[PDB]
Design a protein around this ligand. Structure first.
Ligand SMILES: [Mg+2]
Ligand SMILES: [Mg+2]
Ligand SMILES: [Mg+2]
Ligand SMILES: [Mg+2]
Ligand SMILES: [Mg+2]
Ligand SMILES: [Mg+2]
Ligand SMILES: [Mg+2]
Ligand SMILES: [Mg+2]
Ligand SMILES: [Mg+2]
Ligand SMILES: [Mg+2]
Ligand SMILES: [Mg+2]
Ligand SMILES: [Mg+2]
Ligand SMILES: [Mg+2]
Ligand SMILES: [Mg+2]
Ligand SMILES: [Mg+2]
Ligand SMILES: [Mg+2]
Ligand SMILES: [Mg+2]
Ligand SMILES: [Mg+2]
Ligand SMILES: [Mg+2]
Ligand SMILES: [Mg+2]
Ligand SMILES: [Mg+2]
Ligand SMILES: [Mg+2]
Ligand SMILES: [Mg+2]
Ligand SMILES: [Mg+2]
Ligand SMILES: [Mg+2]
Ligand SMILES: [Mg+2]
Ligand SMILES: [Mg+2]
Ligand SMILES: [Mg+2]
Ligand SMILES: [Mg+2]
Ligand SMILES: [Mg+2]
Ligand SMILES: [Mg+2]
Ligand SMILES: [Mg+2]
Ligand SMILES: [Mg+2]
Ligand SMILES: [Mg+2]
Ligand SMILES: [Mg+2]
Ligand SMILES: [Mg+2]
Ligand SMILES: [Mg+2]
Ligand SMILES: [Mg+2]
Ligand SMILES: [Mg+2]
Ligand SMILES: [Mg+2]
Ligand SMILES: [Mg+2]
Ligand SMILES: [Zn+2]
Lengths: 69, 83, 97, 23, 116, 181
RNA sequence: GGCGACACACGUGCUACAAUGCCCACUACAAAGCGAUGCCACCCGGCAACGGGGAGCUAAUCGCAAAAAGGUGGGCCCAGUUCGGAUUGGGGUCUGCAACCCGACCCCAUGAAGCCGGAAUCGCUAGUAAUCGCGGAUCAGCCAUGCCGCGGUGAAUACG
RNA sequence: CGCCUCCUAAAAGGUAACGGAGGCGCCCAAAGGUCCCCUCAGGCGGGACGGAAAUCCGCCGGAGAGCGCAAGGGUAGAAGG
């Protein structure tokens, strides 16, 4: 590389919210991030976050069976 | 809307007509003047003709249209825009 | 904007527009015709055209009567013109003494 | 706020009660 | 982009700041700050990464939010419109949905005044 | 050369799995990363404030490498383009730096993307190369809210010695590129 | 079923655009009326609308009842905001044979326009205007922000 | 009405008509000298804002691009960048 135009890369630890620490390289030695691949829903199996719904609708109301036959 | 405590409302006289169709093995058009009626899980797959005030309107009933009333799918007002 | 009322009568968008056309005769005087109102009605002896209009210097209120609706609409306009012109020039009446 | 049901002041106005104005 | 996808206003009280997330009003605000034991009075610019991640962790996991909340509202309307119910119709014309009078007014649904 | 986790992962985990999966008869036939070419189409700096030294800075923080300028090949009316105008950046990452970039793209950047639902399965060149676009640079661990004047995205070309898409999906997937379908 | 339509236009009003203000809480002072399948204390369930219990009263007794602005304390700090509360999603409560068209209320979420309004134009001369709440008639419920009343605090200004 | 390019012009040069078509009366301090380096248009496929067309990646692509301006000749084994 040409001298004097490039930000030096040094060993660098990125600290995610799941409490993961990544040993990589950056122009900054230590980084805090809110999320990473280790804890991200799309990555992590299929963590169905807040909606483990099973839809739930629409047949599935069931309040109830009390109308006569 | 109509209280969770009280029943799910269908006019009785439509339900009988539905249930009779279930037994003998369906299916023909059911003329009705019951917009007040809930669509009900046993109604799914029919096509009921609902009155708007002038016309009895064909509504094929589907799985996704279940909690809604009968009149919701037979509109009461003709409107093609202004001018 | 301009509003027309047809009392106990059915009138066409044509007739409505014809009223706008006759009323525009008032734009001659070049002053703001504010929320002009035309009313059309059929009395026993002929039609009546009433109108009430506010301008920066006052109100025009007048009424036409004729066996013919179009003719009454016109007579309405005359009465309106005369009043409007009286509004616009009465102020000039006494610059001396 | 008199038009904001979600306040005390709203419910006095609408003449009603709830979480936001209790009796 | 702190919580959750949005960088909530610093300089603000956490109870208020959180309200600047799509899907979190006064209510859900007071609720999270209890379930994670933080003071509402604390300015966001004063939160421990600790206090922060507690907040973040809970909030993202208990309630549907931002893009996913919108998708559902879209999806809900999407279906209402396609099944052909009367509420679907009002959406299909951009008109009001809750029985309001449309002879006058109705301006928020309609947009500002359209010439004739 | 640097020991970087992803580089190692390639030699250790990915090389073999690939040879298994396609039965290569020569070590050089197995798919390699050639270059990652990052581009900023920009041109919001055409006349305006061609101080996109701010972006060149941002890009150089992300890659550890200073981009070079791109200028218009011809004059264009409707986009307002005098020929020779500075309208973009491009940084060609190779070797160790390419790996480091990807390492963090894969670990950290893509995760931070809004409503991320996986990379696009169909953005495959058809000669075994892959391309994907970002909307914002706040995705990278190095660029904080504090430092940015305005949201700008980028184009990422990842170039591979594989002859076919089918092989490239494999290499990129094994390495850890998350695909939606 | 409609009278509740909706490219548009006009009249009447409500709520605002904020710090003489907004929110939370603690705490005061009215009057006129209304009330037996009627008003409902108190106890319990629910964040709540409300539900279940259940005493009193033909009512100067008992109840609707809390008056609100106000006062004390706390937050907000000039931001389309802790302004504004429109629109919309979802979830409930009630009346009623029945709330698609088309009821009201509650709660979560949404959080519009609006930064004081061109031409023009309304009211009011004192307990008035402005602001603030409470009742009633109609009425199952209610689109009442309408109407008829009732008190609270309480100005400015009239050469002519 | 002078000058340039093509055709007429009969495969050397030349060759008329109030014959058929266009241009000049400038310009460039680099748009000049030299050394070094580089190669186009266009088609398909791929890529945030981004479109027929901005910039990026891939494959094809001998010159159809470029060469200040008309036309012609020339030209990437460069006269182009
Ligand atoms: Mg008269
Ligand atoms: Mg004046
Ligand atoms: Mg508010
Ligand atoms: Mg919010
Ligand atoms: Mg309506
Ligand atoms: Mg493909
Ligand atoms: Mg390749
Ligand atoms: Mg960042
Ligand atoms: Mg009516
Ligand atoms: Mg108006
Ligand atoms: Mg009103
Ligand atoms: Mg009463
Ligand atoms: Mg806003
Ligand atoms: Mg605005
Ligand atoms: Mg607000
Ligand atoms: Mg202001
Ligand atoms: Mg004013
Ligand atoms: Mg005011
Ligand atoms: Mg006004
Ligand atoms: Mg008087
Ligand atoms: Mg007020
Ligand atoms: Mg009242
Ligand atoms: Mg009533
Ligand atoms: Mg309504
Ligand atoms: Mg000459
Ligand atoms: Mg010749
Ligand atoms: Mg010749
Ligand atoms: Mg010759
Ligand atoms: Mg010859
Ligand atoms: Mg010779
Ligand atoms: Mg000649
Ligand atoms: Mg000439
Ligand atoms: Mg040069
Ligand atoms: Mg030269
Ligand atoms: Mg040179
Ligand atoms: Mg090309
Ligand atoms: Mg393309
Ligand atoms: Mg695109
Ligand atoms: Mg393109
Ligand atoms: Mg050429
Ligand atoms: Mg030329
Ligand atoms: Zn993580």
């Amino acid at each position: 590389m040409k001298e004097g135009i490039h930000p030096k890369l040094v060993p660098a630890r990125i600290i995610c919210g799941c409490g993961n620490v990544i040993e990589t390289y950056s122009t900054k030695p230590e980084i805090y991030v809110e999320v990473c691949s280790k804890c991200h829903p799309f990555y992590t199996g299929q963590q169905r976050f807040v909606d483990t719904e099973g839809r739930v609708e629409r047949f599935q109301r069931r309040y109830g069976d009390s109308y006569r036959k | 809307p109509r209280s969770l405590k009280k029943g799910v409302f269908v006019d009785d006289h439509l339900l009988e007509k539905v249930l009779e169709l279930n037994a003998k093995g369906e299916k023909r058009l059911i003329k009705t003047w019951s917009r007040r009626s809930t669509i009900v899980p046993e109604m799914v797959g029919h096509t009921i003709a609902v009155y708007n005030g002038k016309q009895h309107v064909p509504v094929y009933i589907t799985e996704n249209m279940v909690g809604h009333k009968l009149g919701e799918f037979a509109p009461t007002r003709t409107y093609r825009g202004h001018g | 904007t301009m509003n027309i009322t047809s009392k106990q009568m059915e009138i066409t968008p044509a007739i409505r527009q014809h009223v706008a056309d006759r009323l525009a005769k008032l734009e001659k005087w070049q002053t703001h015709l504010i929320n002009p109102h035309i009313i059309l009605s059929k009395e026993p002896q002929g039609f009546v055209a009433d109108a009430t209009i506010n301008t920066p210097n006052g109100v025009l209120v007048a009424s036409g009567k004729h066996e013919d609706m179009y003719t009454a609409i016109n007579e309405l306009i005359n009465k309106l013109e005369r009043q409007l012109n009286k509004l616009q020039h009465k102020g000039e009446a006494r610059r001396a003494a | 706020g008199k038009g904001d049901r979600r306040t005390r002041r709203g419910k006095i106005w609408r003449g009603t009660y709830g979480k936001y104005r209790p009796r | 982009a702190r919580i959750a996808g949005v960088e909530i206003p610093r300089n603000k009280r956490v109870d208020v700041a959180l309200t600047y997330i799509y899907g979190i009003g006064k209510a859900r605000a007071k609720e999270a700050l209890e379930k994670t034991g933080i003071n509402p009075a604390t300015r966001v610019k004063d939160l421990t990464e600790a206090e922060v991640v507690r907040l973040r962790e809970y909030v993202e996991n208990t309630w549907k939010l931002e893009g996913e909340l919108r998708a559902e509202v879209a999806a809900n309307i999407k279906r209402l419109m396609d099944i052909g119910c009367y509420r679907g119709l009002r959406h299909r014309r951009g008109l009001p949905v809750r029985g309001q009078r449309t002879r006058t007014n109705a301006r928020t649904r309609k947009g500002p005044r359209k010439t004739v | 050369p640097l020991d970087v986790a992803l580089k190692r992962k390639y030699y250790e985990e990915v090389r073999p799995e690939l040879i298994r999966r396609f039965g290569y008869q020569n070590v050089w036939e197995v798919p390699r990363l050639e270059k990652v070419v990052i581009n900023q189409g920009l041109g919001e700096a055409k006349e305006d404030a061609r101080i996109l030294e701010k972006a060149a800075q941002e890009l150089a923080l992300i890659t550890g490498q200073k981009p070079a300028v791109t200028r218009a090949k011809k004059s264009i009316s409707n986009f307002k383009l005098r020929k020779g105008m500075p309208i973009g950046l491009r940084v060609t990452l190779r070797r160790d730096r390419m790996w480091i970039f990807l390492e963090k793209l894969l670990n950290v950047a893509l995760p931070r993307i809004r409503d991320f639902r996986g990379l696009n399965p169909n953005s495959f060149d058809g000669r075994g190369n892959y391309n994907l676009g970002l909307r914002e640079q706040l995705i990278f661990p190095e660029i904080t809210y504090d430092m940015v004047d305005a949201l700008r995205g980028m184009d990422i070309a990842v170039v591979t010695t594989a002859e076919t898409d089918e092989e490239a999906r494999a290499l990129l997937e094994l390495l850890g590129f998350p695909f939606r379908k």
